[PDB]
Structure formats: C-alpha cells, structure tokens
C-alpha cells in the first residue's frame, strides 16, 4: 500500500436536464454512481493518515473553483487591474453530493477509527473505490450540510497548541439553522437556531477542547476582525450571498464546573451584492436579491475556530473565535478519512 498522487475523477447523480448549476457541472465533469459499491475491510492493517497534507483536498479545491468560475455571473468582476462587465442573471443554485474516485490501478483507504484525531496511525481501515457523497458547501465559521462524527465530538488540528493553525470541530449531532429572507429592507434576513440545542453543544465542545488544555477555562468569543466574509457567518443560499452576525453564538465562558446541567437564537443577516471572492483575490458585484421568500434550512455539523495566542494576563483561560476563509478546510472536514494509494 504505497501512497502516491493520482488524478481523480468524480461521480454524481446529477440530472442531465437540470439547469441547477451544480447539476450542469457534474453532468459534463463526472460519471454515474455505482449503485452497490464494494468496500473491503482490511485486516491486521495499520496505516498513517494526515488530513492536513491530503492531495485529495487540493484536487477537490480546483474542481469547486472551476465550478464557481463558470457558474456564478457577477455584473462586474474586479481581478487585479482587470475589470469585467457582463450580464448577471439569477441562477439555480443548490449543491449536490460529489463522490471522488481513484482511477484504475489506485484505490482509496478509508480510516474507520471513530476517535481518529486527523494525524497518525489508524487500525480499523477500509478500502473503497469512491468517497461518500460530499456536498461542496462554501461557508465560513460554520460547516453546513456535512457529515457527522460517529460517536463523540472530535477536535482536529494540525497542532492544537499552535494558534496559527485552524481548529476543525466535527459534531456528532446536527444543529439546525433556518435562514429566511422574509417576502422594508429587501437585504434584511435572519437565521434561527435553538438556544438549548446550541448551548448544550458548546458545553460538549468545551469539554473536548478542555482535554488539550487540561483544567483551563474555555471561552467562545466573536471574530477579532477581517473582511465581512469571515467576521460574519457567510454562506450562499439560492444564489444569494448571506452575511450573518454570529456574535450571539460566540459569547460565553465555560469552566470545569460550567459543564454541569423552546426558544430560538436569531442572528441578524444581510444579503450582500458586493462580495469578496474566495477563489481568487478580487471583488464581485451581483444583482439585488430575487423577490419572494428566500428560505434554506441547513445542518450545522462542524465549526472552524481560531485560538487566541499570547500570555493571558489573567492566569489561565483559552479563547476560541470563529475562523474560516480557506475553503480547503471545508473540504478537509469531509476528506480527512481518505487517502489515495497505488494498488500494490
């Protein structure tokens, strides 16, 4: 099982007739899905995975960049000295699952350890031809519509004590997020999240974070700065770019005694037309929103966090703020289990 890089191909259940923009890309860039795929459980097998150096991530990144670049039509695009003006009609936008598959002569190894921390050896290993269907949801702060951990919440980081490195939280229970632009200001919207469900989730996340900072008070705090796409929970719903003030979800402290025990939490949101692109450095202006209700209820299955560094002058308290921005971490949260291996 020697590991090497290999050009992947995709499989999806896209509809050849759909105008939905993910369906159009997959129809001419992927192949049909194997209805009953094979999966061989390897025995007495131990291999080393490294989610932070996975070429599968870089390959999926090039795909979704290519998708978005030939799909979303901004009225004006500003890309380093160049400025483009074109027609900007509204599009049908709803991501579909995309499987990633090894070519002939290669395979994919899937790590089935349910407490796998992202790096190091794995003992319960499978081999598949393709990954599970991954929805390429472009978002920040919150990871939407992903796949859950199978037992407990898991904290993943290339080095957890290195504040320069992002932290990817993977939940084991979904937390709903219902976002509506009600059919005043046509750019005004909001997202409701269950107060009890979210606060109970923060309790369990703090405990998992507490394992790498034993004792220590765990704190969640709002973003420290940056462009609107990362200070606010940013995501795309029906082709429109939502920007939600997430302060209400990162404003709490938890000590080794706070882990010891309806109504919504509704964040104010804006639908922006002037967006800061994530694929390349540049600014794109889109048309004002469509008329009618703009509703999409997604599943929060992960969090992107950045820990504050420096000697805390209080004594001992770790502060975690919502991060994101590099969409490779979004694909990473789904591709951490897999690696490509040449059949040998």
């Amino acid at each position: 099982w020697k590991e090497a890089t290999a050009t992947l191909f995709c499989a999806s259940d896209a509809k050849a007739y759909e105008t939905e923009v993910h369906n159009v890309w997959a129809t001419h860039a992927c192949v049909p899905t194997d209805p009953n795929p094979q999966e061989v459980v390897l025995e007495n097998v131990t291999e080393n995975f490294n989610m932070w150096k996975n070429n599968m991530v870089e390959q999926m990144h090039e795909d979704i960049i290519s998708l978005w670049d030939q799909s979303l039509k901004p009225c004006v695009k500003l890309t380093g000295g160049s400025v483009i003006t074109q027609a900007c009609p509204k599009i049908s936008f709803e991501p579909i699952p995309i499987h990633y598959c090894a070519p002939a002569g290669f395979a994919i190894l899937k790590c089935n350890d349910k407490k796998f921390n992202g790096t190091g050896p794995c003992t319960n290993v499978s081999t598949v031809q393709c990954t599970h269907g991954i929805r390429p949801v472009v978002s920040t702060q919150l990871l939407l519509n992903g796949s859950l951990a199978e037992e407990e919440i898991v904290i993943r980081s290339e080095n957890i004590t290195d504040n320069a490195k992002i932290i990817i939280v993977q939940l084991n229970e979904t937390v709903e997020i219902n976002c509506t632009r009600p059919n005043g200001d046509i750019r005004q919207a909001h997202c409701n999240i269950s107060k009890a469900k979210w606060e109970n989730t923060l309790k369990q996340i703090a405990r998992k974070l507490r394992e790498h900072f034993k004792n220590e008070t765990i704190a969640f705090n709002q973003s420290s700065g940056g462009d609107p796409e990362i200070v606010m929970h940013s995501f795309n719903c029906g082709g429109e770019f939502f920007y939600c003030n997430s302060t209400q979800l990162f404003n709490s402290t938890w000590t080794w005694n706070d882990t010891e025990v309806n109504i919504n939490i509704t964040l104010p949101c804006r639908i922006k037309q002037i967006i800061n692109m994530w694929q390349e450095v540049g600014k794109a202006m889109y048309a004002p929103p469509i008329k009618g209700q703009i509703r999409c209820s997604s599943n929060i299955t992960g969090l992107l966090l950045t820990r504050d560094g420096g000697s805390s002058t209080n004594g001992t308290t770790e502060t975690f703020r919502p991060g994101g921005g590099d969409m490779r971490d979004n694909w990473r949260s789904e591709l951490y289990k897999y690696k490509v291996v040449k059949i040998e």
Partner: antibody, heavy 122, light 105 residues
Framework: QVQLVQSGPEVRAPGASVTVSCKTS????????IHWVRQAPGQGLEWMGW????????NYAHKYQGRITLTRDTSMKTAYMQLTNLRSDDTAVFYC???????????????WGQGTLVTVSA | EIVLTQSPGILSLSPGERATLSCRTS???????LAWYQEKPGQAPRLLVY???NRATGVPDRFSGGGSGTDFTLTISRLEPEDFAVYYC?????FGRGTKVQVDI
C-alpha cells in the same frame, strides 16, 4: 529578494494613536502571514499579533486585544498596524516580520523589517 | 502559556572563549520547534537557529543549537567580536527574557 520596509520613526503624546506600515516586496504577498513584534528597552521581544492576508483574519495577543488593529492592502502588498491609547511606557521599536519558507512552520521568522521606533512623550 | 527561562541572564566573556546559552521550556516541545535569535543594537533581530538544531541561512558554523525535551542549548564555539549581543529563546509566539553576552577582554 524578500524585503520588509517599514515607515519612519514617530513621536506621539500619551493617549494619542500611531499607525505603522510595512511595505512588502520579493514574494507573493497573499501566501504568508505577517506578524508584529514589540521591542522595548528592558522587555526584550514580544509578539503582538498576526494578520492573514487571505481576507483580513487576525490573531491578537491577550495583552493587546483592546488596543491593536491589524489591516492590509493586498493591492499594494503592504501590512499596517494601528495602536491606540499610548501610555508613557509604550516607547518601543515595532518590527514587521515574515516566516522562512512557504507552507511550513509559521514562527521561524527569517525576514524582519528594519523596525519603526515610536517614542511616547509629553 | 509557555514560559521560557533563559539562564544565565548576564554572561561576561572574552573574544575566543566558548559561550553556552541555556533555555528551558515549561513543557515538552519535541525537537523541531524552538528557535534562537540574535539581537544587536541598531539592526533588526536575526534568526539564528530553527527547529532546535538547524542553522539559518547565512549564519556560520560557530553557532550550534542542541537539545530536545525541555533543555536546549545555543553554543558559540569561538565567539567573535561580532557575536557579542543578546540572544532570545523562542517557541510559538512566546519568548525567553533573553541572555546577554558581554565583551570583557
């Protein structure tokens, strides 16, 4: 050749603000963090924060969180640091710094700016 | 947090002698993290050693870094007049409070 050029020395009164620029050349600006280090006469080298040029992501040290703001101008390949509510003992040399090799360890600071001396006096 | 105790604080030596600088961290940090810097008045600090033992570009073989668990050593084999300065221990964003070598013919 990687070059970090900072702005000239500044004199400020207590309570005033100061902004320091770091003009960058020699590499792809958006691929490296930019950190800022404070160098006081008897306090010897202190990290203040970093800015990720991809969007404007920042990390502020606890000691500076209320008083520091890190911004950038990717078009001009220039990083900026603003400090407010300057105290009598805030006199220091501030450095703009970058890491050694792309994609690798973030704290091996091989490239420093020449430094900007900020003198706080009434 | 991670405190880095550098000992001794002052180090008086003559050109030609050997200077052994100590640094001890509060936690185990492996053998490929700790870095050393040279601070001379009038110029920016200079990275000397990274990953505990790797010499940075442009530094002579007189400078040698060692150590693994919590004890690290920056050694200056022969100590030239250029080498009299203050040297800082670093891990992550944290710094030792420095150790100065002084000219004392």
């Amino acid at each position: 050749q990687v070059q970090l050029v900072q702005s000239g020395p500044e004199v400020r009164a207590p309570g005033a603000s100061v902004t320091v620029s770091c003009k960058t050349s020699g590499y792809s600006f958006t691929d490296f963090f930019i950190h800022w280090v404070r160098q006081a006469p008897g306090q010897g080298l202190e990290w203040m924060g970093w800015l990720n040029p991809i969007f404007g992501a920042v990390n502020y040290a606890h000691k500076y969180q209320g008083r520091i703001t890190l911004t950038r101008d990717t078009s001009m390949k220039t990083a900026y640091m603003q400090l407010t509510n300057l105290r009598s003992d805030d006199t220091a040399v501030f450095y703009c710094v970058r890491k050694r090799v792309y994609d690798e360890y973030d704290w091996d600071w091989a490239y420093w700016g020449q430094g900007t001396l900020v003198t706080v006096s009434a | 947090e991670i405190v880095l105790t550098q000992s001794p604080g002052i180090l008086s030596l003559s050109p030609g002698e050997r200077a052994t600088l100590s640094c001890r961290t509060s936690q185990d940090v492996g053998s490929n993290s700790l870095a050393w810097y040279q601070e001379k008045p009038g110029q920016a600090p200079r990275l000397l050693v990274y990953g505990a033992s790797n010499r940075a570009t442009g530094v002579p073989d007189r400078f040698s870094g060692g150590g693994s668990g919590t004890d690290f050593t920056l050694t200056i084999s022969r100590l030239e007049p250029e080498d009299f300065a203050v040297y800082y221990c670093q891990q992550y964003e944290y710094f030792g409070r420095g150790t100065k070598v002084q000219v004392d013919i």
